[PDB]
């Protein structure tokens, strides 16, 4: 009985906490969504109602988002520099090895979620998703759970799982979300982590369900898809470049920096204001399809009907409010053809999107990118339709094309072909399986050969302590050997040395693991000793050895001339905590994680 209970406990306990976390995440997503939604509705109502006078309308359009943005900023600013505007990259860094304790603290939670919510409410004017922040939150929760329960590896795994769950929840999409997270965040992942993530996602889905009460492709087609993917990749590279440079400029340019220092919220507010005017429906949004929710846009993009043909058949009417059945009517204009409108959107979102990303607040930057990709895809589809009105020898459905574009562009941006999978999941259909995937792959090829990932770019801009190789990031990763960053301080307990001396040493340092040396002159290692054990022995060094104190031999030895990178890799893979260094056999020093972290920091920031 007791034995059975014991057996049940560890594994079961592990499962249970994860499940709980998942549930919590689901709850957060539901509640957050609800909070967003009502606000959005209210805003819409206000827009409808305030009147026909222009100024008032403008104010309604412009003020509400601005205020929200400001609110988001303010909460972020008060706690710590690395709180707001950071999720995935930070997580990645953590996974790589270097720990930033500021990131996992729970005092930060309440201020960030609210900000995220505000951002969401602000919506399609500001044009930002929720992913990264959500992921961060999830990770934090996981960390908290771990702490409550209370090795490094296990903790890391837990964090990963949490992240996966977070990703799933935002997407409302279990199967692929976790995979995507794994692709983006980590490296040296295990299947069990993935499984855990999946489980969490499933739990979240279940929770959502529970809470529901409240509330045949041809051969040229493939070629076309590939072309689309390529185009996306091209575009994505450019986008990535822009992201890399704009952020740098912001960091750099002195006046801007000063302004930020004075008031980040002010900067954010200003940005919002700038966005808002451009958006404004009757002035310029009639061209940009402005008057639409975030999901609404996506829906419009991935619509089954082929727009150009429809337009040709009949001029669509501009309604008072956007039709729930016919979202795509927003994209049409008489003077500017649907194609033209799409082009405009592409031009303008790109211009704006980077700016939006820049502004300091809790916000996600995946969804917008996806939407952009979809738009591009749709344009291509439309073009194809125009070319071949009959179709290829079944007609060309541009929805599929749009979907492919969304999959592809995002993947290119993110260096992750899980994007395709995610897209498929969102669709609900696995009939577009190959071509889309191929397109995504193509995009990745063109993007990953030229540029770093969006996330990677962001990390570079930050100068966060992440060791691995990134494209377009000049740094001395191969040069720094162990000699430069190793700890020269050692506590050599040689056989030959007297007992009093040893005692004194013990009294002084009290290190976790003392090295055992052959003799004082040679300084050559013959294994290791633990401190507590030594103390015990003393209470009760050749003499000591004779008496019978256990010599745990050194399993693995680094040279001083070995590269930092290799060492780091070793540390990551074998799950080690410390490791001694030998030069011609001599105990020169002692590599821990701390030293490695320090080295990484140095590399990042001169």
């Amino acid at each position, epitope marked *: 009985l007791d034995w059975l209970k014991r057996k049940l406990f560890c594994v079961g306990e592990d499962w249970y906490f994860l499940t709980v976390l998942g549930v919590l995440m689901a709850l957060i997503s539901f509640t957050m969504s609800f909070t967003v939604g009502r606000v959005v509705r209210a805003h819409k109502w206000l827009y409808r109602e305030i009147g026909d006078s222009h100024l008032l309308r403008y104010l309604s359009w412009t003020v509400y988002p601005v205020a929200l943005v400001s609110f988001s900023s303010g909460f972020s600013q008060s706690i710590t520099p690395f709180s707001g505007g950071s999720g995935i990259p930070e997580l990645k860094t953590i996974l790589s090895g270097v720990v930033l304790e500021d990131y996992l603290d729970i005092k930060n939670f309440g201020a960030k979620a609210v900000g995220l919510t505000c951002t969401l409410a602000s919506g399609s004017t500001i044009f930002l998703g929720k992913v990264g922040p959500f992921v961060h939150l999830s990770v934090m929760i996981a960390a908290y759970l771990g702490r409550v329960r209370a090795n490094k590896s296990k903790r890391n795994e837990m964090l990963v799982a949490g992240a996966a769950v977070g990703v799933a929840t935002v997407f409302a999409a279990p199967f692929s979300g976790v995979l995507f997270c794994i692709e983006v965040v980590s490296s040296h992942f295990s299947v069990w982590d993935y499984w855990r993530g999946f489980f969490a996602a499933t739990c979240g889905a279940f929770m959502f369900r529970l809470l529901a009460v409240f509330n045949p492709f041809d051969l040229p087609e493939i070629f076309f898809f590939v072309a689309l993917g390529a185009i996306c990749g091209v575009a994505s590279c450019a986008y990535l470049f822009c992201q890399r440079k704009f952020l740098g400029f912001v960091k750099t340019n002195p006046v801007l920096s000063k302004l930020m220092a004075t008031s980040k919220p002010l900067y954010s507010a200003l940005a919002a204001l700038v966005l808002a005017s451009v958006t404004y429906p009757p002035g310029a949004g009639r061209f940009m399809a402005s008057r639409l929710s975030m999901r609404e846009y996506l829906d419009s993009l991935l619509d089954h009907n082929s727009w150009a043909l429809l337009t040709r058949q009949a001029s669509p009417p501009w309604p008072v409010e956007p039709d729930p059945q016919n979202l795509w009517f927003e994209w049409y204009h008489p003077q500017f*053809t649907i194609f033209g409108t799409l082009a405009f959107f592409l031009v303008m979102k790109f211009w704006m999107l980077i700016l939006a990303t820049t502004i300091p607040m809790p916000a996600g930057y995946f969804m917008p990118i996806f939407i952009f990709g979809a738009a591009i895809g749709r344009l291509l589809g439309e073009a194809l339709s125009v070319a071949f*009105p*009959e179709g290829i020898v079944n007609p060309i459905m541009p929805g599929g094309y749009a979907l492919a574009g969304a999959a592809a562009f995002s993947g290119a941006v993110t260096h992750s072909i899980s994007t395709a999978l995610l897209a498929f999941e969102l669709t609900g259909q696995i009939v577009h399986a190959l071509p889309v995937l191929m397109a995504v792959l193509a995009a990745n090829a063109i993007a990953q050969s030229c540029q770093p990932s969006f996330y990677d770019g962001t990390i570079i801009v930050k100068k966060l302590p992440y060791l691995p190789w990134i494209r377009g990031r000049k740094i001395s990763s191969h040069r720094v050997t162990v000699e430069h960053f190793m700890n020269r301080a050692i506590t050599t307990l040689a056989k030959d040395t007297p007992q009093e001396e040893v005692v004194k040493v013990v009294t002084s340092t009290d290190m976790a693991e003392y090295p055992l040396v052959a003799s004082t002159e040679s300084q050559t290692l013959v294994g290791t000793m633990r401190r507590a054990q030594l103390v015990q022995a003393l209470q009760a060094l050749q003499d000591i050895l004779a008496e019978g104190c256990p010599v745990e031999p050194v399993t693995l030895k680094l040279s001083p001339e070995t590269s930092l990178h290799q060492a780091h890799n070793l540390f990551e893979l074998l799950n080690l905590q410390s490791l001694f260094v030998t030069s011609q056999g001599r105990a020169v020093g002692f590599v821990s994680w701390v030293e490695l972290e320090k080295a990484i920091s140095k590399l990042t920031n001169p």
Partner: antibody
Amino acid sequence: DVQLQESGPGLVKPSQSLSLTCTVTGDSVTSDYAWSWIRQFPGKKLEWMGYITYSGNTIYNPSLKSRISITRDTSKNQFFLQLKSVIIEDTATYYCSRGVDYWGQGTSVTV
Amino acid sequence: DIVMTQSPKFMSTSVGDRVSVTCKASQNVGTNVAWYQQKPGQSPKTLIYWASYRYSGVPDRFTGSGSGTDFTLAISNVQSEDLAEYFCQQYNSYPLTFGSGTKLELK
């Protein structure tokens, strides 16, 4: 106020190619619309013929690809059919239209 | 060709009553369906270009609805001037198809 007006011969001998001139007033042919042809039988059942784009690429009903041929003159703003291999079953009242929005008054073709 | 099967074929009502003509498509059309009125002799004038969007210069009593595979034209407060045939046309797919047509007499 876009207005379409058909014109052509009513009585026709079978196995002799017919042609109908549809003139436009109020709108240019070079605009991006579906300049389409439709016909209604004596039993009051509508059948879609086809249409030309702004550029000139013609699209037809799959059932009548062989016989139908539709053209335009951009100078006069008109539409010309060249319906060949005429049969007594083809006897109908024809209708030249701008997709779905505006329709012509139509002419009664007889074989 | 995607067939547009409609019903009921014949109708006979008084002045003031409601009439509802139903159209059904074999494949999914979306909302890309237009309604016509043809009085005997004249050309068929369009009423509702997209399901539930009336044309300019048409009375409000002609209320259309539906999406996907089924659609309805609803007419309330029928007058003596509405003795006519009513067709539904789809225009999602090529070729463009039509309904057979509903003749409407009055008492």
